[PDB]
Amino acid sequence: MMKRLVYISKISGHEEIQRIGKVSIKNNQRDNITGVLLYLQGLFFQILEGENEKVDKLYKKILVDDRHTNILCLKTEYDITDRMFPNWAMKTINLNENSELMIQPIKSLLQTITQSHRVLEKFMPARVIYLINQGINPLTVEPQLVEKIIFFSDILAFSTLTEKLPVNEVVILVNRYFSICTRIISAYGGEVTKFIGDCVMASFTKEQGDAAIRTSLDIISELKQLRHHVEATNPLHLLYTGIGLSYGHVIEGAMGSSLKMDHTLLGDAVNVAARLEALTRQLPYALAFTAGVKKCCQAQWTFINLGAHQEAIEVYTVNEAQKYYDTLQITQLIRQTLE
Amino acid sequence: MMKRLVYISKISGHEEIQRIGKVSIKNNQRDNITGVLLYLQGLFFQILEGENEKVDKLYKKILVDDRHTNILCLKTEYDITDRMFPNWAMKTINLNENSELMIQPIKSLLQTITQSHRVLEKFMPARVIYLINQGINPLTVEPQLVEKIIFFSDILAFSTLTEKLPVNEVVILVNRYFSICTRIISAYGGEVTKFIGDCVMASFTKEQGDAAIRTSLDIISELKQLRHHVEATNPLHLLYTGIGLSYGHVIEGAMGSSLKMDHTLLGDAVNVAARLEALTRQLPYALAFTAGVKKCCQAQWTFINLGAHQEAIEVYTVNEAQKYYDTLQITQLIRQTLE
Ligand SMILES: Cc1cc2nc3c(=O)[nH]c(=O)nc-3n(C[C@H](O)[C@H](O)[C@H](O)COP(=O)(O)O)c2cc1C
Ligand SMILES: Cc1cc2nc3c(=O)[nH]c(=O)nc-3n(C[C@H](O)[C@H](O)[C@H](O)COP(=O)(O)O)c2cc1C
């Protein structure tokens, strides 16, 4: 039983690589692993093949290696019938250091496609990248009914802010907001589906109840630090958020046609979380979630019941989500500052 | 003044390619154009370089050529200082037909990266693909304030349908719906931003007023044909839509961080179009748009003024958008059929 994987990576910092192939040779030679490692203008390409399990450890050892970064496994071939390089413990080819005409073609293509690839990667849904990082083709996965926590957040009084900031300040502000949201959601095990306007869409599993709530609090908290970090001429000092969470059945998977695919979550919980985010504009709290979310949590939160809003939904929060301000006073305090 | 471009394509049908390189040699040799064309397992890679304008025609001639399809230009280099293949009218290399060990590595990589590339392409926003298809890096474009028509459509009584169809029928239905929407929007010059649940988001320019309205009508019409095409056991016979259009300033461009980017439209018109789509559930029409959309149209539509809904917005339709049914009678006619 043998398997084969392939990945691409980026070097972590700046002919320093002659000796690292002069480590791979020895330890692959010991587990009957073969494979190739290419190098071209800041980028790494490796193929690894051997019996399914001792292949898997070194790849974990490679994952945590200080000198490359941004690792993504493209293909996995399970129970391969025979090897692609039966004689190569680890063949190392520095494609930068070849000056023959006949190879410059393929060398330039390989460079252009993978640089393109790396840009496209940044626009993928987290979940599609994750599937590719196992050996699963996202255009062949059947979508599945699953129980998820759905997350939405967007910028408060953002219509006021688009009306009275120049375009280039708006973009600086929205990028900052997206990068803080994405960093914290990811750190806690969740996945960003997409951005919809100033809106961040994300989801967590039913086991990540407390992490979805911690995520929400850490985002609210980081905006608070940021607001007093900057000067009053910086649009960042007027940046506030509201967050809605919900929990339910959703159908998750890749959908559409061969003109266009997207990663999509179908089911009513998606709409519910969006309306709780909207609702926070009229509550003295910045986070609102359903009862189903409350029941997914193991930590000992102080829950606060906010009655039924709309068929009805019971709405809840935690008191650490309490505001130190009044929402109307700030949405018109944003208007006054902006003149 | 010379320029260079590179693209990848897919063959349109199934050693039939020896003579097509035996046409390129002669006509490139006549305009002082050089370049490379590779072939590998169903895929084409070409590089073209010459003085900026007579490069551009043959590439248009290539675009309309019967035997490859799915053409995407990755890179463009304007006013290149000197050529990459100074001596090659058109070098043709069938990478399938080489059986040397030392090249199989790079050949297998090139295959894996570009096959991966082709899947990622299907998940991109139309507008990011379009930029790449010119020579513009989407991670370097500054976003721009622009006047757009915003389009939203989603499935009527979809919550009833998710509650009472099996997951695999839901997916068949949603895929059908997305592929009809995407085909018609594209045919008419618009671009799909993303899918949000059962929702299709798209936009048109201010010059495409009548095309956004024709798009909406052609989608409604195709669902009507489809409903009487199929049997009553097919979920497709219960598939209806509502469509909202709006027009306003939006900031359009690539935003986020290096963890995640998305193609995004900021501004209040986005929210407005979503609420008009929602509003159609209570109107005897399936399409609703603002006054600003009405003013973008040159054709001689019969407009119907639907009063103000919400600051107020005047709502409009055309009478070809008139329903032959009652929306509540059908949303509960969908419930009865489904038992
Ligand atoms: C791109 C890349 C590929 C690598 N491939 C291998 C490999 O195939 N086999 C291996 O043993 N180490 C490989 N390494 C490095 C290992 O992590 C190396 O064994 C480590 O630096 C030291 O091993 P040790 O600490 O267990 O003694 C690779 C590193 C990089 C950056
Ligand atoms: C992948 C691909 C690359 C091509 N590259 C060229 C080219 O570089 N130069 C060229 O003249 N024709 C190229 N062709 C085909 C042209 O369209 C060809 O000139 C056409 O079939 C007949 O030309 P004509 O009808 O003007 O006589 C290419 C076709 C394909 C599928």
* DSSP string for residues in A260-293: -EEEEEESHHHHHHHHHHHHGGGSSBSEEEEHHH
* Total domains in the fold of chain A: 2
The parent domain of residue B137 ranges over: 1-141
* Radius of gyration of the CA atoms of chain B, in A: 25
CA separation for the pair A67, B332 (Å, rounded) = 61
- Which residues in chain A are contacts of B171 at CB distance < 8 A? 142-143, 251, 253, 255
Residues A203 and A339 in one domain: yes
User: Residues 301 to 320 of B: which have CB under 8 A from any A CB?
Assistant: none
Residues B12 and B112 in one domain: yes
Size of interface A-B (CB pairs under 8 A): 222
Residues A78 and A158 in one domain: no
- Could you tell me whether strands A91-94 and A34-40 are parallel, antiparallel, or unpaired per DSSP bridges? parallel
Cα separations (Å) of B191 from A272, B125, B182?
28, 8, 8
Residues B37 and B146 in one domain: no
Residues B109 and B176 in one domain: no
- The residue among A119, A141, A163 that closes a domain is A141
Token duo for residue A300: 């000992």
Q: Which residues pair with B147 in a beta bridge?
A: B249
- Which of B27, B31, B40, B59 for a ligand 2 pocket mutation test, highest count of atoms within 8 Å of Cβ? B27
Residues B33 and B80 in one domain: yes
- Residue in A130, A219, A266, A271 to test binding to B, most B beta-carbons within 10 Å: A266
- The residue among B97, B117, B141 that closes a domain is B141
- Burial class of residue A236, CB neighbours in 10 A (0-12, 13-18, 19+): middle
Q: How far is B316 from chain A (nearest CA, A)?
A: 23
Pocket of ligand 1 (CB under 6 A): A 9, 20, 23-24, 27-28, 37, 44, 46, 58, 61-62, 65, 67-68, 90
User: Residues 44 to 63 of A: which have CB under 8 A from any B CB?
Assistant: 45, 47
For B42, phi then psi, to 5°, come to 75, 5
- Residue in B37, B116, B137 to test binding to A, most A beta-carbons within 10 Å: B116
Residues B169 and B233 in one domain: yes
C-alpha angle B238-B239-B244 in degrees, rounded to nearest 5? 140
Report yes or no: B220 and B241 within 8 Å, Cβ to Cβ.
yes
Flag if B167 and A251 touch (Cβ within 8 Å).
Answer: yes
Residues A120 and A222 in one domain: no
User: Residues 78 to 137 of B: which have CB under 8 A from any A CB?
Assistant: 84-85, 91, 93, 95, 103-110, 112-114, 116-117, 119-126, 128, 132, 137
CA separation for the pair B187, B181 (Å, rounded) = 10
Residues A173 and A258 in one domain: yes
Q: Tell me the technique behind this structure.
A: X-ray
For B297, phi then psi, to 5°, come to -95, 135
Residues A223 and A134 in one domain: no
Residues B127 and B174 in one domain: no
Q: Determine if ligand 2 sits within 6 Å of the CB of residue B11.
A: no
**CA A99 – ligand 1 centroid, Å:** 28
CA separation for the pair A94, B298 (Å, rounded) = 61
Residues B230 and B135 in one domain: no
Q: Which residues contact B310 (CB under 8 A, 6 or more apart)?
A: none
- The residue among A77, A111, A141 that closes a domain is A141
List the single residue in A with minimal CA-CA distance to B8. Answer: A113
Strands of chain A (E only): list them: 2-11, 34-40, 43-51, 68-77, 91-94, 144-155, 191-196, 199-205, 241-256, 261-266, 287-290, 303-309, 313-318
Give, for B33, the enclosing helix (H) or strand (E).
none
**CA B23 – ligand 2 centroid, Å:** 7
Task: Check the CA dihedral A87-A90-A94-A95 and report its sign.
Answer: positive
CA separation for the pair A28, A7 (Å, rounded) = 17
Flag if B162 and A265 touch (Cβ within 8 Å).
Answer: no
Give, for A125, the enclosing helix (H) or strand (E).
none
